[PDB]
Amino acid sequence: MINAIRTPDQRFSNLDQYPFSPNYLDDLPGYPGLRAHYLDEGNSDAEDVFLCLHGEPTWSYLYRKMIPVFAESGARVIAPDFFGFGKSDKPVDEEDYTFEFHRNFLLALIERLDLRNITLVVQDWGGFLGLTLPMADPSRFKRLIIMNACLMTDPVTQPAFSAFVTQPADGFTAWKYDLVTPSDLRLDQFMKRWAPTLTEAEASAYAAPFPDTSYQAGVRKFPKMVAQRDQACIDISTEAISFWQNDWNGQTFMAIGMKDKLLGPDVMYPMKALINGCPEPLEIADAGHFVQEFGEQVAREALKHFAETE
């Protein structure tokens, strides 16, 4: 019912460091005929589940360095690709992508797989969306690993979550310009610019899902939704603030990519105060926005922090 396209499988033949078998679901309530891809790694009967959410304009490939660490620790790791990204199906019209469309997919996924004892791992859009999940069913969430992300609230409630859109000119402004304007958007080139330590093979893995601009509607809409927040987004995100501040009682681990011009320290310190019991953050001096690219360290430290209370 949603007009969508699917990336040819051959586009993923040659991926670097991505030996994870695909799992797919196409029978999701509210998403008729759309196939979603997700990784399911580690012991499937584990008590702990790490749910790893990606952001713009990435995919589960982003968690490739963290997956193995978490799995070896004894947990199961779920890393889905949102519709419009990675190996998931891609709606062709930008109007089909909304905050609720992606949020509801996540709740559906979680129910479908009956996930519990979840350790939420978020960053960027993965956090804008993922941070609003617990309030919907708190019993299934137990820990949080938060990297450069915040809540899409209104400017008055949390100015820190809106100021970055406008300043600096080489921050979100540049980011959005790079993504929504080009008529021939090359994601490998964009990733190399924003994640300078990527090797060429890695960069190409980011372009793999999109053979041409027709597969990029979800890619183009994400930045627009940061700039133009709809009411449902605002209301949902505002209610999540209260959850984190007063309801949350789980364990938290925070990591900040210090060189991020978007969701760095002036967004993270403010987030830190809103999360009840959040501890001192792990600042990674050489990491930019894509904290996951220096993920092994993050995965190891978080596990160390959590054990030290369990």
Give the CATH number, domain containing residue 180. 3.40.50.1820
Q: Is the dihedral of CA 110, 252, 21, 3 positive or negative?
A: positive
175 is in an annotated binding site: yes
CB 294 within 8 A of CB 287: yes
Which contiguous run of DSSP H or E holds residue 223? helix 217-227
Q: How, if at all, do strands 36-41 and 23-25 pair?
A: antiparallel
Helix pair angle (231-242, 99-112), 10° resolution: 50
Is residue 124 flagged as an active site residue?
Answer: yes
Is residue 260 flagged as an active site residue?
Answer: yes
3-state secondary structure of 73: coil
Distance CA 18, CA 42 (A): 15
User: In the chain, how many domains are there?
Assistant: 1
Place of tokens 């078998």: 21
Place of tokens 């460091």: 17
CB 65 within 8 A of CB 296: yes
Q: How, if at all, do strands 49-52 and 76-80 pair?
A: parallel
CB 267 within 8 A of CB 160: yes
| From 54, 102, 289, 305, active-site residue | 289
| From 260, 266, 286, 305, active-site residue | 260
Q: Which long-range contacts (CB under 8 A, 24 or more apart) does 226-229 make?
A: 226/128, 226/152, 226/165, 226/172, 226/176, 227/165, 227/176, 229/99, 229/152, 229/154
Strand partners, 118: 49, 141
Name the method of structure determination: X-ray
| From 37, 124, 188, 305, active-site residue | 124
125 is in an annotated binding site: yes
Q: Which domain holds residue 79?
A: 1-310
Backbone angles phi and psi of 145, in degrees to 5 = -120, 110
Q: Token pair for residue 187?
A: 């994601």
Is residue 45 flagged as an active site residue?
Answer: no
